[PDB]
């Protein structure tokens, strides 16, 4: 785990998530996809405690997919984010809390608007134009404060994101083995293969 | 009607027919007695010898609770054992909390409340036994008789089973002829006589006599079975009186 970023632009939400899985002094994998598709127009990235992350992600995925089949309908990004927040807000006072931080990028088809939600393991939810979890934010937030505009295109968002990855690759202590980038818009979720 | 099909149901009389039906099971059983004496109590019971193949002295029916109380019963033998098992639990918890061994009146109400509880619900059956029990405590000797309804009283003498009326008549004579009191050793002999006299109401099969006693002077306030010389002496006394 470690680096997960998110940028909301004019027409889409872009999520970038690091590919490394490190345990001890060994990088066990350099192609890890730290994300789950909750619904056709909703994507969740995650970072935190080993085991907890994927277990929580897949548990949420199962619940949203169950809802979809039951109602023959897709929950709004706002509705999904609130469900996820509550699950984490329950968790934090359990015997063993989920130590997982998530970003939820979705395209609301009723509003025709992209939406990005940042939720930490405590269940602290905020809607943001751009978001980050962990130490990443300490570099990317100030960078985005300067270069981000609300009316940017998906291409402009990807260039803005390249600027973030470059900064992290220059100043971060650990080798996070690049990022997998995914776009969420009116047409659903797709992966950028050459980043 | 149908009032008699379910336990705890009042009939229009105000009766619980299921308890009265349990009393019939008691009347069907063998005779057992209790005699209160100067400083203790004596228990005796009729053991029908169904076959030559029964090992003599080896199907013991009188039961001890704690170390100072004796219990005997007529009717469904397993039901009596259940009641004694509870009695032993009740006595153990009393001694645990209060240190002193359970007094006889205290013990009597423990059994009474437990048997009475089995007349409160349709999901349980009343006890098919009348139980004669007692012993010696700090206030002297006590003898009790407990019935399927949960009813119990203190007794000078007590009898139940198929030969209860014969035994009761014989008990009443002792109470009249001995206003000052009967001795423990005398009461053992009398118990033998009364069981032999009450055996007339069950005389197809011959029987085996079983006696026990608690006495402040003779057994030091503890429950003991009468065996050997004292038993044979009591049997002979009884044999002489029937002829």
């Amino acid at each position: 785990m470690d680096i997960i970023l998110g940028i909301r632009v004019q027409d889409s939400v872009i999520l970038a998530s690091s590919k490394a899985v490190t345990r001890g002094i060994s990088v066990l994998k350099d192609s890890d996809d730290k994300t789950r598709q909750l619904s056709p127009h909703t994507l969740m990235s995650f970072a935190g405690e080993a085991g907890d992350t994927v277990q929580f992600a897949e548990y949420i995925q199962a619940n949203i997919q169950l809802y979809s089949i039951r109602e023959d309908y897709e929950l709004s990004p706002q509705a999904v984010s609130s469900f996820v927040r509550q699950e984490l807000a329950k968790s934090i006072r359990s015997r063993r809390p989920y130590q997982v931080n998530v970003l939820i990028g979705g395209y609301d088809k009723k509003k025709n608007k992209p939406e990005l939600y940042q939720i930490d393991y405590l269940g602290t939810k905020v809607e943001l134009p751009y978001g980050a979890h962990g130490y990443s934010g300490f570099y990317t937030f100030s960078l985005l404060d300067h270069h981000y505009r609300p009316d940017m295109t998906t291409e402009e968002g990807l260039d803005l994101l390249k600027l973030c990855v470059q900064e992290l690759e220059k100043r971060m202590p650990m080798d996070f083995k690049g990022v997998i980038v995914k776009i969420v818009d009116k047409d659903g979720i797709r992966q950028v293969d050459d980043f | 009607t149908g009032y008699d099909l379910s336990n705890s149901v009042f009939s229009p009389d105000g009766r619980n027919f299921q308890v009265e039906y349990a009393v019939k099971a008691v009347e069907n059983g063998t005779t057992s007695i209790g005699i209160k004496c100067n400083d203790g109590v004596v228990f005796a019971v009729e053991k029908l010898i169904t076959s030559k193949l029964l090992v003599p002295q080896k199907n013991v029916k009188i039961q001890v609770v704690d170390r100072h109380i004796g219990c005997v019963y007529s009717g469904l033998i397993p039901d009596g054992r259940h009641l004694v098992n509870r009695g032993r639990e009740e006595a153990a918890s009393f001694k645990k909390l209060y240190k002193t061994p359970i007094p006889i009146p205290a013990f009597a109400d423990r059994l009474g409340q437990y048997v009475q509880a089995h007349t409160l619900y349709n999901s349980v059956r009343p006890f098919g036994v009348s139980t004669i029990f007692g012993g010696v405590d700090k206030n002297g000797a006590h003898l009790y008789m407990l019935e399927p309804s949960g009813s119990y009283w203190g007794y000078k003498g007590a009898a139940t089973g198929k030969g209860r009326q014969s035994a009761k008549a014989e008990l009443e004579k002792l109470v009249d002829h001995h206003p000052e009191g009967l001795s423990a050793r005398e009461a053992v002999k009398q118990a033998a006589k009364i069981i032999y006299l009450a055996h007339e109401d069950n005389k197809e099969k011959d029987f085996e006599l079983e006696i026990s006693w608690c006495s402040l002077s003779e057994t030091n306030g503890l429950h003991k079975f009468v065996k050997g010389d004292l038993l044979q002496e009591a049997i002979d006394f009884a044999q002489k009186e029937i002829n």
Partner: protein, 240 residues
């Protein structure tokens, strides 16, 4: 907790509560399943003593259990929701642990097991429902059609019907369905299904529902006009 053994054996060896649950199925609206060479079609009767209905919002007779499997039924409507819900939950649970959607056989086996459990559990009555479960196994193009019933038995069928007058439509299917040559196309399969319902239904108006399931999660429900074209075409060939 309520404990009463409601489903018990009778002197002749029958469990009447299970058998009476079958009578509830016999009262329910007719449902039919026919599988072709490359598809399965589920047809369902809807009674017309109910005008002023709102068909947008009224519960549909065929339910998606997952994106690749569907379930139709005959009998008590309220009962069927409980089975459908449990099936949908198991569908997601299977994907979670096995990392693969359910086979139609497995999903059927689960639903049948639930039904069986309600025949020897205290305090419960059996489900007044028989189901037709149809679909395609993951990465498989062979059509699957299964039937369950209140007792808990389940089996595979080339074509099958349940509900009221199902014995009449089963008769039709038994002479009109060739095992050696199943309906080669979607059109052929839908037509044979619509034909079989027209033996029992009444008007081919808003009385027949048709749902077509094709391989790789390809499920669509036909509209009134689309079904009405099959009704119109069949009647014109009949006058001969």
């Amino acid at each position: 907790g309520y404990d009463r053994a409601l489903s018990i054996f009778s002197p002749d060896g029958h469990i009447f509560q299970v058998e009476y649950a079958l009578e509830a199925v016999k009262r329910g609206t007719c449902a039919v399943g026919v599988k072709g060479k490359n598809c399965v079609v589920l047809g369902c009767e809807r009674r017309s003593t109910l005008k002023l209905q709102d068909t947008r919002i009224t519960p549909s007779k065929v339910s998606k259990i997952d994106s690749h499997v569907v379930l139709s039924f005959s009998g008590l409507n309220a009962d069927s929701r409980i089975l459908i819900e449990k099936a949908r939950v198991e569908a997601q649970s299977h994907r979670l642990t096995l990392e693969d959607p359910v086979t139609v056989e497995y999903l059927t086996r689960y639903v049948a097991g639930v039904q069986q459990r309600y025949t020897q559990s205290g305090g419960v009555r059996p489900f007044g429902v028989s189901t037709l479960i149809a679909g395609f196994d993951p990465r498989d193009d062979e059509p699957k059609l299964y039937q369950t019933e209140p007792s808990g038995i389940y089996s595979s069928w080339s074509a099958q019907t349940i509900g009221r007058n199902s014995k009449t439509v089963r008769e039709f299917l038994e002479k009109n369905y060739d095992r050696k040559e199943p309906p080669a196309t979607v059109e052929e399969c839908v037509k044979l299904t619509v034909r079989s319902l027209l033996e029992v239904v009444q008007t081919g108006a808003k009385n027949i529902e048709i749902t077509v399931v094709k391989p790789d999660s390809d499920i669509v429900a036909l509209s009134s006009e689309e079904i009405n074209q099959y009704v119109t075409q069949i009647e014109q060939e009949k006058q001969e």
